[PDB]
Design a protein around this nucleic acid. Structure first.
Ligand SMILES: [Mg+2]
Ligand SMILES: [Zn+2]
Lengths: 49, 146, 49, 50, 1122, 49, 97, 50
RNA sequence: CCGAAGCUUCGGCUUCGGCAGGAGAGGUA
DNA sequence: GCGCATGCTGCTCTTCTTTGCCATCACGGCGACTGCCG
DNA sequence: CGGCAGTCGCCGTCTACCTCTCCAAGAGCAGCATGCGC
């Protein structure tokens, strides 16, 4: 769910400690579910063949 | 549910008596090799022990039967022989697995056919080949499409 | 039974095939690959061979 | 300069007793020598210190 | 700063620091100090809370004893552990393939109650491996590291879920011990509570309360506020306690006659007896804190009690109803809430001491069982403590832990940073944790309680993402296993300077401010409102009048490798992850140099790693050479330090130490005396400074490729030394004894010219593929011959001639000089394995330059292989004729959000050239906040920009217009950081300005010379006669299942058939194909593969009658032979 | 002249479709790396890192 | 063999008669291999009589060691004088009591 | 040049050779492009040696 | 099948000598 | 001078499963089954 | 008898490559070989 507080600074100005910390919550979920997707798709391909 | 089993043994010319064994086959020796471990000793084969257990139990059973033993002891030996054969054909299906050095369960005859690391999916559907190589690829912009 | 034994559940299919005394005609891609013959597709069909 | 040869030394991965640099650093230091020659054949110089 | 002799690195930081980073290896040494019980830990524990200085082994030895028998006539006890001196030094153990250990002794006493005599004597309990001063163990000659484990702690855990049909709230309870049986109370679809004893069946809790000895009126007297309890007490049909015990017995024990005394002895043997149930000190302390039981008394005894069960049921029902606070008779008020199990207040850390103590306990229990069983079969008056004790289980457990274990890992010694990082790793797997397959997606998330205890960035990239992490710089561990972190207390809106360490369970009741907060001279916040952290990791904007704590530094939440990236706040998390991971893969180069732009963490990341030499006292240097330094102390003592010249690490790299002092210098204690592998004057240096251009160039840097210059090969800028090791063994045989000698009757004299008079090579010889290292022969037996040959070869000549050839040769594709030989013999009193006579090791070294295919990297996530190397005349060059060193593409920067590299190049150019700010009319407006020493710099200056408080963009933009000119009065790079370049192939200038600067480039350990492979024919397997696998065994490449589908979709029926029969398995066709190719004829027709026959013989052994029929029956033989 | 007009097959894993295997005509280069055309990287899905 | 002549692959349950047919002999002793003589035992799991000679055109004794004596069964040892590749395709059986 | 490929003693150490005596070269062109279509170029070269 | 050594009529013949399985951890695309 | 006793040493197996040891094991789909309630 | 719902077990979870370490041992039963005693 969205956090009601935004990140008002671009990467050209540099984030602070708290903005950088709360930015990492959603940047790890994608990296963690890509690896599961790769193993979920190969089984489907093998079953379809 | 029952007719599927009762009709298969009727439509063909086989018998339902092939489910009870009275002789056990033995694989050729070159399919279960035993080799030296770098000038030391031999360290297990995972299949020459499951055969040895069956042979020992059968020999003890034969000697006890041709001796006039009481019924209880003969029954105990027969149960133990049955368990040993069952562990030879499928280790871990009933009871606890038979382990070796290091509490590592032994691998039976039916464990060399199943799984993604078995015969079917690792030796028959894909192999290693001659005349092949490997290296790191880099970009060449002076080549053509062929 | 050769094509189904190499997909999944080897023990169950092998047991049922043994009980039923099934016969395989070796007329597919997977079986012809397994026994070492020309697959019945592409240049392995009668017209082109 | 195409080659060097030190006494008491077999390869370049070693040290000389009494000298503060190993042979690798000595070679890397000798890589900046500026020399001039006129003959068309190899010539040999010398270096002795104590 | 704070180090006696250090380079002067000026900094852009604007904040001050009230704390110094702790010892970076104190997470490893403190636990071993506690386990050993040494005086240092005793004094440290006496510093605060000196109640029970109990060692690690002493508590095990005291929980064990006394050991009693069934009759109760004799007993045995243990006490007073003590250690001897270490047998051999570290280097001897590393050389002769030994273990670094010291013997352990305990005292045992034997009391006999029948008589009353006592016999006590000292027993020996085996060698105990010991940890060196760097936090590592040497086991069988190899360095190892034990890694800490993150496990869920014992206690009581309340949960709540949503129903499916009625769609309401359902609650549960789980009491988890350290070792014992489990309990589980919960509420069901209807208003019926139930207990699950020992993970079986389900009964209403009324039977349990009755089995505890409770009447039907006391339940209402206590639990008299819920209709659920009314329904449960009404429907129990177990009036009378004995009926309840009988029902419990029949539920637990199957097929038994229910007997009440057996039921009692089985009930009190499950939870209430301190022999088979253990709620450890952590578990007892947690249960005494969540339920709010008696608090204040010291913890003694670690078993469950009846009041605990009653309080747990009361808590569950109160949580079900909806109450928020709850009190217990004799306890304080406690909140009523459901707890999360991934919270860092619930996950504890099992360090090395508690990992070794478990194995010692297991061995102790086995030995105790043996002594108890053997105490009743020996004769009295001959029983002594030495005859009852067996040492084998303990040594077996110790050697099984330190060897085949998942947590004592092989150390990685690529460079000092990787070694330091290996020792600070928190691992979530292992025997008692998780699995790579069972672990889901919620245990791999950044919890809000990780702030200051775990690093959110440094984590693996493959299947172990989120299962391995790193400790933060300021974190430290409780005496229970909970990680703490420091804060500065604020009162009345003014920040004080008193530091308090808080665990994750205590900082959620306070408002904690942010590190980057404006603070005046007195200490009052400038901004009216500040960004804080509330209870549940919630971020809010509240005003600077109600906060209670503050952070200690902006780098409190990062690890030691993440705190080494300049301009980190300008980079995305995904690229910074790779940047931190790739700093541990750099290789040491023959010459090192420190970064032009750094962070300041590089000085204490090299001293704490331990690959440098520091002085233990103050004095003057007396003598300096290439391998020793002699220091004369002020009192008179003289100390000498030796160096490791060209030593091989765990990964084949070179570890070389060099002195950096003169012959008359004065040295202060703590000063760095000698350099190391990746060190430049005391600070870590993993790469080199190179001149960059950001532009596309003819497609040679397309898709992450890199173009290099030829000056980087002719000047040894990126060159490394790699060392290899080979061994061979001479042993006996049943037909004789193998001997190493130069005499070999099979090979010529041309290849035996580099051997000495002993059969070994000579130092300084250049070996190649197929070359000879040692010469050894094998006897084939000395026996008699036939009577005719006696006289026949007496006339001719008869010799022994039983010698075969077995010589150690250089493997395929290897070369290099020989730099050392280590020979071990049996007759000269050297430890050797039984059965062997002589050992020899040979070391081979090579020098590797840079080439196409080698991997380069930066600190921000840039990564690619080298596509081309160009002559220096083909390279873009500046207006004065200076060529560039590397070209990087501009298409990869914007879409990956790593713009810190461009800022780094700008600052690097400014630092290289040097600047000077004019203050004739006062300091400019943009330089108001700069220090006074950063208003002027010299060429080739070193600066420092901390990780979250560094150089701004107004400062960079203003410094880019102040740089000094070169030899001639020209400024090549203008105010935007762009320069005009010429084209080195055509001569015309490039039409638009290009960005130029300096950047820090490292060389990664992925070299193309170790990845090229090819094969035509070679060794084959034994069971299935397919080619072998691997590069060391000259193996083939797998043609898998997914690669066959492409062949079948193309329509290629002949390529697939040839690939599957005559190149893999067809034994008879393999030879005929080779003969046909050599003779130039046509390739023959494939046969039948061998794996099919192996499969058929496998199927026939399971009593399956599988046959191959023909067109008219008549099964084919399928075995050849005719 | 031995390797003149003798094609070879290049393969990258995973082979997710047909174009993961293609046939080229070899040329001898200097170095220890294989050189690939820029226009086949989309079919092979291969960057250069 | 020619793969272009196969037509079927039949599977089914095996009886004791078939198991006794496939076998070339019965194993009796659980012994595996002689550690000192480095030669297979007798009636063991690696026996030369049941399965086949370990070396080409050889036997347990030394009466026949050439290639012209093939086809003759050794009368004192019982080992066939033939190739050593027959150890990959000859089976045995155990007689259960 | 490896000493095993030239027939030399063990103590000899081969060394890389850089024969170039030139350090830095650059050039600058000043172009006269006045009207009347009478135009010419001027070249200035700088050579620095060792 | 390879090497060494003899005969060798140049097709080849003879003597001797010789092997490759599992578990765990980390990493790259 | 001879017989008996005890330690080097060949020499070939042997290694379980209770009232014990042992501590657990995801997550979803599917199908029998089995005591249990009516 | 006749439904019935929990339950308990069995099946499955991407490909290719590189580097390192470690893989039952003590107990027991003869079979003598030599020393010591009457
Ligand atoms: Mg890539
Ligand atoms: Zn014979």
């Amino acid at each position: 769910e969205f956090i009601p507080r935004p990140v008002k600074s671009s990467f050209r100005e540099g984030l602070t400690v708290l903005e950088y910390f709360i930015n990492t919550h959603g940047a790890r979920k994608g990296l963690a579910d890509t690896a599961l997707r790769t193993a979920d798709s190969g089984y489907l391909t093998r079953r379809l063949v | 549910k029952r007719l599927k089993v009762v009709a298969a043994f009727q439509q063909s010319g086989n018998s339902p008596m092939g489910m009870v064994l009275d002789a056990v086959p033995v694989i050729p020796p070159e399919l279960r090799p035993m080799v030296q471990l770098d000038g030391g000793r031999f360290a297990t084969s995972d299949l020459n022990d499951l055969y040895r257990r069956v042979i020992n139990r059968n020999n003890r059973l034969k000697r006890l039967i041709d001796l006039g033993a009481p019924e209880i002891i003969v029954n105990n030996e027969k149960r133990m022989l049955q368990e040993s054969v069952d562990a030879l054909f499928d280790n871990g299906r009933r009871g606890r697995p038979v382990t070796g050095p290091g509490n590592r369960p032994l691998k039976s005859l039916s464990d060399l056919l199943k799984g993604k690391q078995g015969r079917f999916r690792q030796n028959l559907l894909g192999k290693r080949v001659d005349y092949s190589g490997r290296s790191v690829i880099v970009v060449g912009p002076q080549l053509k499409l062929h | 039974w050769l094509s189904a034994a190499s997909f999944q559940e080897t023990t169950r299919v092998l047991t049922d095939a043994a009980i039923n005394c099934r016969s395989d005609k070796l007329n597919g891609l997977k079986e012809n690959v397994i026994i070492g013959k020309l697959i019945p597709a592409g240049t392995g069909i009668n017209r082109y061979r | 300069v195409t080659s060097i040869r030190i006494d008491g030394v077999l390869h370049e991965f070693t040290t000389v007793p009494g000298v503060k640099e190993d042979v690798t650093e000595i070679i890397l230091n000798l890589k900046s020598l500026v020399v001039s020659s006129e003959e068309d054949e190899p010539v040999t110089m010398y270096l002795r210190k104590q | 700063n704070s180090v006696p002799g250090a380079p002067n690195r000026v900094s852009f930081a604007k904040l001050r620091e009230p704390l110094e980073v702790p010892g970076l290896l104190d997470v490893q040494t403190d636990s071993f100090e506690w386990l050993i019980g040494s005086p240092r830990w005793r004094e440290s524990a006496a510093e605060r809370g000196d109640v029970n200085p109990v060692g690690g082994l002493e508590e095990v030895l005291y929980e064990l004893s006394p050991i009693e028998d069934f009759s109760g006539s004799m007993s045995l006890s243990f006490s007073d552990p003590r250690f001897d001196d270490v047998k051999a030094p570290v280097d001897e153990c590393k050389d002769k393939d030994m273990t670094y250990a010291a013997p352990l002794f305990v005292t045992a006493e034997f009391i006999n109650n029948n008589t009353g005599e006592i016999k006590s004597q000292t027993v020996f309990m085996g060698d105990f491996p010991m940890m060196t001063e760097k936090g590592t163990f040497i086991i069988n000659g190899t360095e190892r590291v034990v890694v800490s484990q993150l496990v869920r702690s014992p206690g009581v855990y309340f949960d709540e879920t949503i129903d499916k049909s009625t769609d309401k709230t359902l609650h549960s309870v789980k009491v988890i011990p350290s070792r014992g049986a489990w309990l589980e109370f919960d509420v069901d679809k209807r208003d019926t509570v139930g207990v699950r004893i020992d993970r079986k069946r389900r009964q209403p809790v009324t039977v349990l309360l009755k089995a505890l000895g409770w009447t039907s009126e006391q339940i209402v007297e206590r639990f008299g506020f819920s209709e659920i309890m009314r329904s449960t007490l009404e429907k129990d049909n177990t009036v009378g306690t004995d009926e309840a015990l009988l029902d419990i017995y029949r539920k637990l024990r199957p097929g038994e006659p229910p007997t009440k005394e057996s039921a009692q002895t089985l009930l009190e043997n499950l939870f209430f007896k301190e022999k088979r149930y253990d709620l450890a000190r952590v578990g007892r302390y947690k249960v005494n804190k969540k339920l709010g039981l008696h608090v204040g008394e010291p913890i003694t005894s670690s078993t469950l009690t009846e009041e605990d069960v009653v309080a747990t049921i009361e808590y569950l029902v109160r949580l079900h109803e909806g109450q928020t606070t709850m009190t217990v008779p004799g306890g304080v008020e406690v909140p009523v809430e459901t707890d999360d199990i991934d919270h860092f207040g619930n996950r504890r850390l099992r360090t090395v001491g508690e990992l070794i103590q478990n194995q010692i306990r297991v061995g102790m229990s086995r030995m105790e069982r043996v002594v108890r069983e053997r105490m009743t079969t020996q004769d009295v008056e001959a029983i002594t403590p030495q005859t009852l004790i067996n040492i084998r289980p303990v040594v077996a457990a110790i050697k099984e832990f330190f060897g085949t274990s998942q947590l004592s890992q092989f150390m990685d010694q690529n460079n000092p940073l990787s070694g330091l990082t290996h020792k600070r790793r928190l691992s979530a797997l292992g025997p008692g944790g998780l699995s790579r397959e069972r672990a889901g997606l919620e245990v791999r998330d950044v919890h809000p309680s990780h702030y200051g205890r775990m690093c959110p960035i440094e984590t693996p990239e493959g299947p172990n993402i989120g299962l391995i992490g790193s400790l933060s710089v300021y974190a430290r561990v409780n005496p229970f296993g909970f990680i703490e972190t420091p804060y500065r207390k604020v009162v009345d809106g003014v920040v004080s300077d008193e530091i308090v360490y808080l665990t994750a369970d205590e900082e959620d009741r306070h408002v904690v401010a942010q590190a980057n907060s404006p603070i005046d001279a007195d200490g009052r916040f400038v901004e009216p409102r500040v960004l804080v952290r509330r209870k549940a990791g919630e971020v809010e904007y509240v005003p600077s009048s109600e906060v209670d704590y503050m952070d200690v530094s902006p780098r409190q939440m990062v690890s030691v490798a993440t705190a080494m990236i300049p301009f980190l706040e300008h980079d995305d998390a995904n690229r910074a992850l790779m940047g931190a991971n790739m700093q541990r893969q750099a290789v040491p180069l023959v010459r090192s140099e420190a970064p032009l732009v750094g962070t300041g963490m590089e000085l204490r990341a090299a001293i704490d790693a331990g690959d440098v030499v520091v002085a233990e006292e103050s004095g003057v240097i007396e003598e300096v050479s290439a391998d020793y330094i002699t220091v004369m102390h002020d009192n008179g003592t003289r100390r000498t330090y030796r160096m490791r010249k060209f030593a091989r690490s765990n990964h084949g790299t070179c570890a070389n130490q060099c002195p950096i002092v003169d012959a008359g210098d004065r040295v202060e204690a703590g000063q760095v005396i000698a350099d190391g592998p990746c060190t430049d004057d005391g600070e870590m240096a993993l790469g080199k400074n190179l001149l960059v251009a950001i532009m596309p160039w003819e497609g040679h840097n397309y898709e992450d490729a890199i173009i290099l210059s030829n000056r980087l090969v002719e000047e040894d800028v990126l060159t490394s030394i790699h060392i290899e090791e080979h061994e061979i063994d001479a042993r006996d045989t049943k037909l004789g004894a193998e001997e190493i000698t130069r005499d070999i009757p099979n090979i010529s004299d041309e290849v035996l010219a580099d051997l000495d008079e002993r059969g070994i090579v000579r130092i300084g010889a250049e070996v190649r593929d197929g070359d000879i290292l040692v010469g050894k022969v094998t006897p084939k037996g000395e026996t008699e011959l036939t009577p005719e040959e006696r006289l026949l070869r007496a006339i001719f000549g008869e010799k022994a001639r039983e010698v075969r050839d077995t010589s150690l040769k250089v493997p395929h594709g290897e070369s290099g000089k020989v730099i050392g030989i280590r020979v071990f013999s049996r007759e000269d009193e050297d430890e050797l394995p039984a059965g062997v006579n002589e050992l020899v090791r040979v070391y081979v070294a090579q020098k590797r330059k840079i080439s196409d295919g080698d991997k380069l990297a930066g600190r921000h996530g840039n990564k690619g292989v080298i596509g081309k190397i160009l002559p220096v005349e083909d390279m873009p060059f500046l207006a004065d004729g200076t060529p560039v060193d590397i070209i990087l593409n501009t298409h990869g920067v914007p879409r990956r959000m790593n713009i810190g590299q461009i800022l780094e190049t700008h600052l690097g150019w400014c630092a290289h050239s040097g600047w000077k700010v004019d203050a004739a009319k006062g300091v400019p407006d943009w330089a108001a906040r700069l220090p006074d020493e950063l208003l002027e710099a010299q060429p080739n200056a070193i600066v420092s920009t901390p990780v979250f408080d560094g150089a701004q963009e107004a400062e960079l933009q203003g410094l880019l217009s102040c740089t000094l000119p070169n030899r001639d009065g020209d400024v090549l790079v203008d105010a935007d950081g762009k320069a005009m370049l010429f084209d080195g192939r055509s001569g015309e200038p490039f039409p638009y300005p290009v960005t130029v600067g300096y950047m820090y480039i490292m060389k990664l350990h992925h070299l193309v010379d170790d990845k090229i492979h090819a094969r035509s024919t070679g060794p084959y397997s034994m069971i299935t006669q397919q080619p072998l696998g691997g590069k060391a065994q000259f193996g083939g490449q797998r043609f898998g299942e997914m690669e066959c589908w492409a062949m079948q979709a193309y329509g290629a029926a002949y390529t697939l058939q040839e690939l599957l029969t005559i190149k893999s398995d067809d034994t008879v066709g393999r030879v005929k194909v080779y003969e046909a190719i050599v003779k130039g004829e046509n390739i023959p027709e494939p046969g039948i593969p061998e794996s099919f026959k192996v499969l058929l013989k496998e199927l026939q052994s399971l009593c399956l009658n599988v046959e191959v029929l023909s067109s008219d029956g008549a099964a084919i033989e399928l075995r050849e032979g005719e | 002249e031995v390797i003149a007009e003798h094609p070879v097959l290049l393969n990258r894993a995973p082979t997710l479709h047909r174009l993961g295997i293609q046939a080229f005509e070899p040329m001898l280069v200097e170095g220890k790396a294989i050189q690939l055309h820029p226009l086949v990287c989309e079919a092979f899905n291969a960057d250069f890192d | 063999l020619d793969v272009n002549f196969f037509d079927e692959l039949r599977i089914g349950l095996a009886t004791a008669e078939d198991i006794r047919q496939w076998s070339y002999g019965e194993v009796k002793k659980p012994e595996t291999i002689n550690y000192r003589t480095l030669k297979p035992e007798k009636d063991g799991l690696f026996c030369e009589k049941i399965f086949g000679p370990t070396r080409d055109w050889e036997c347990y004794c030394g009466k026949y060691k050439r290639v012209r004596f093939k086809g003759i069964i050794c009368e004192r040892c019982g080992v066939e004088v033939t190739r050593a590749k027959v150890r990959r395709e000859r089976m045995g059986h155990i007689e259960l009591a | 040049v490896q000493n095993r490929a030239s027939g030399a003693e063990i103590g000899r150490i081969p060394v890389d050779s850089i024969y170039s005596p030139v350090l830095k070269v650059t050039y600058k062109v000043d172009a006269t492009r006045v009207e009347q279509r009478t135009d010419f170029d001027k070249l200035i070269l700088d050579v620095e040696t060792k």
